[PDB]
Design an enzyme around this catalytic site. Sequence first.
Site, PDB file in Angstrom:
ATOM      1  N   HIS A  61       1.319  -0.994  -0.131  1.00  0.00           N
ATOM      2  CA  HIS A  61       0.088   0.081  -0.261  1.00  0.00           C
ATOM      3  C   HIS A  61       0.991   1.131  -0.202  1.00  0.00           C
ATOM      4  O   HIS A  61       0.125   2.041  -0.252  1.00  0.00           O
ATOM      5  CB  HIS A  61      -1.289   0.092   1.168  1.00  0.00           C
ATOM      6  CG  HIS A  61      -1.918  -0.951   1.220  1.00  0.00           C
ATOM      7  ND1 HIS A  61      -1.200  -2.173   2.543  1.00  0.00           N
ATOM      8  CD2 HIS A  61      -3.071  -1.721   0.235  1.00  0.00           C
ATOM      9  CE1 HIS A  61      -2.697  -3.081   1.953  1.00  0.00           C
ATOM     10  NE2 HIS A  61      -2.903  -2.930   1.310  1.00  0.00           N
ATOM     11  N   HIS A  91       5.587   7.355   5.577  1.00  0.00           N
ATOM     12  CA  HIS A  91       5.652   6.808   4.190  1.00  0.00           C
ATOM     13  C   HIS A  91       4.871   7.869   3.609  1.00  0.00           C
ATOM     14  O   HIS A  91       4.675   9.281   4.076  1.00  0.00           O
ATOM     15  CB  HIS A  91       5.033   5.184   4.296  1.00  0.00           C
ATOM     16  CG  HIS A  91       3.633   5.903   5.845  1.00  0.00           C
ATOM     17  ND1 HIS A  91       2.946   6.056   6.444  1.00  0.00           N
ATOM     18  CD2 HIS A  91       2.062   6.521   4.629  1.00  0.00           C
ATOM     19  CE1 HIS A  91       2.218   6.696   6.993  1.00  0.00           C
ATOM     20  NE2 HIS A  91       1.856   7.191   6.127  1.00  0.00           N
ATOM     21  N   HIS A  93       3.011   9.076   0.304  1.00  0.00           N
ATOM     22  CA  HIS A  93       1.157   9.151  -0.559  1.00  0.00           C
ATOM     23  C   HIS A  93       1.064   9.195  -1.330  1.00  0.00           C
ATOM     24  O   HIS A  93       1.740  11.100  -1.370  1.00  0.00           O
ATOM     25  CB  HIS A  93       0.179   9.195   0.280  1.00  0.00           C
ATOM     26  CG  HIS A  93      -0.280   8.590   1.423  1.00  0.00           C
ATOM     27  ND1 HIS A  93      -1.117   7.137   1.476  1.00  0.00           N
ATOM     28  CD2 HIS A  93       0.285   8.544   2.434  1.00  0.00           C
ATOM     29  CE1 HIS A  93      -1.106   7.835   2.376  1.00  0.00           C
ATOM     30  NE2 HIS A  93      -0.338   7.694   3.716  1.00  0.00           N
ATOM     31  N   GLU A 103      -3.223  13.168   0.657  1.00  0.00           N
ATOM     32  CA  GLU A 103      -4.290  13.194   1.415  1.00  0.00           C
ATOM     33  C   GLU A 103      -5.304  14.554   1.863  1.00  0.00           C
ATOM     34  O   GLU A 103      -6.150  14.952   1.375  1.00  0.00           O
ATOM     35  CB  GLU A 103      -3.731  12.476   2.056  1.00  0.00           C
ATOM     36  CG  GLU A 103      -3.326  10.858   1.956  1.00  0.00           C
ATOM     37  CD  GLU A 103      -3.238   9.813   2.560  1.00  0.00           C
ATOM     38  OE1 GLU A 103      -3.242  10.220   3.953  1.00  0.00           O
ATOM     39  OE2 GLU A 103      -4.606   9.011   2.334  1.00  0.00           O
ATOM     40  N   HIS A 116       4.069  11.169   6.164  1.00  0.00           N
ATOM     41  CA  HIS A 116       3.501  11.170   6.470  1.00  0.00           C
ATOM     42  C   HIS A 116       4.562  10.227   8.017  1.00  0.00           C
ATOM     43  O   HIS A 116       5.069   9.509   7.666  1.00  0.00           O
ATOM     44  CB  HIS A 116       2.499   9.958   7.249  1.00  0.00           C
ATOM     45  CG  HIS A 116       1.060  10.718   6.623  1.00  0.00           C
ATOM     46  ND1 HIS A 116       0.049   9.918   5.357  1.00  0.00           N
ATOM     47  CD2 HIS A 116       1.485  11.627   6.072  1.00  0.00           C
ATOM     48  CE1 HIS A 116      -1.055  10.976   5.351  1.00  0.00           C
ATOM     49  NE2 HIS A 116      -0.515  11.985   5.467  1.00  0.00           N
ATOM     50  N   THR A 195      -5.262   7.060   7.383  1.00  0.00           N
ATOM     51  CA  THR A 195      -5.830   7.274   6.834  1.00  0.00           C
ATOM     52  C   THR A 195      -6.191   5.576   5.919  1.00  0.00           C
ATOM     53  O   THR A 195      -6.976   6.122   4.268  1.00  0.00           O
ATOM     54  CB  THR A 195      -5.482   8.094   6.150  1.00  0.00           C
ATOM     55  OG1 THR A 195      -4.501   8.252   5.396  1.00  0.00           O
ATOM     56  CG2 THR A 195      -5.376  10.378   6.288  1.00  0.00           C
TER      57      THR A 195
HETATM   58 ZN   LIG Z   1      -0.177   7.847   5.466  1.00  0.00          ZN
END
Ligand SMILES: [Zn+2]
Length: 257
Positions: A61, A91, A93, A103, A116, A195
């Site tokens: 992910h 990590h 996104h 996000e 994050h 999230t």
């Molecule tokens: Zn995150």
Amino acid sequence: HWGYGKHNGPEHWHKDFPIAKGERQSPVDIDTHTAKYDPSLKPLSVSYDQATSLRILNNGHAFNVEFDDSQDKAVLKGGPLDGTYRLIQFHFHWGSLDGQGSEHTVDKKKYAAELHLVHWNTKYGDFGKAVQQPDGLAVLGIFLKVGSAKPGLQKVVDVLDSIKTKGKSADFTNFDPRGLLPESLDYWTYPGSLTTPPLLECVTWIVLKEPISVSSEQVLKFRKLNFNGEGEPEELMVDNWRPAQPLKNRQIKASFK
Ligand SMILES: [Zn+2]
């Protein structure tokens, strides 16, 4: 089997994780015209001088850079927080295109990516107990825009080839997360959630106002990662972001005028 596809993406998550439709979900849109300055907020204290990274992992992910969280080596304090929060992992996104990937949004603006840095409240002893608490986690969120390279990211970019597919890990010692921070620690804060599933409402979000710049080559390498495992059909790890969720009965507070 949740993910970011057609059949398993954010709009489906509520079937397995009904808190997806809860009262304190993340991310949110940060309306800079309604966020109010809160003079009671304190400066952030980011203490990463003793941070001990260990490993980097493709979890299917995103990828996580993991730290030693068995002592107060890399901690976040101050700001809106009470107590001490230990860094466990960071990590990102990111998008398929430079015009999406974050996000959180700022006045509906999407950034190319979002970092994050995840921390847990030491009063709860371990991450797994922390996520069961409304004040269990503090996540520092940092926007990425495409422009100049970020030299402090390059060590992450260069290891990605070794963790292309789900389940791969690689040693990743001596990485300094201070090289991912912008100049200013001005921030917005609000109460929210993880999230990704399980979407637990355990997070004090601290979202920095100032983005970092990464190069187009750096983001391109993120987009070569795969969601799939080795020996399965290739599906590029892109657009691994959840869209903004309703603010509901929350206020976003600003640390800065
Ligand atoms: Zn995150």
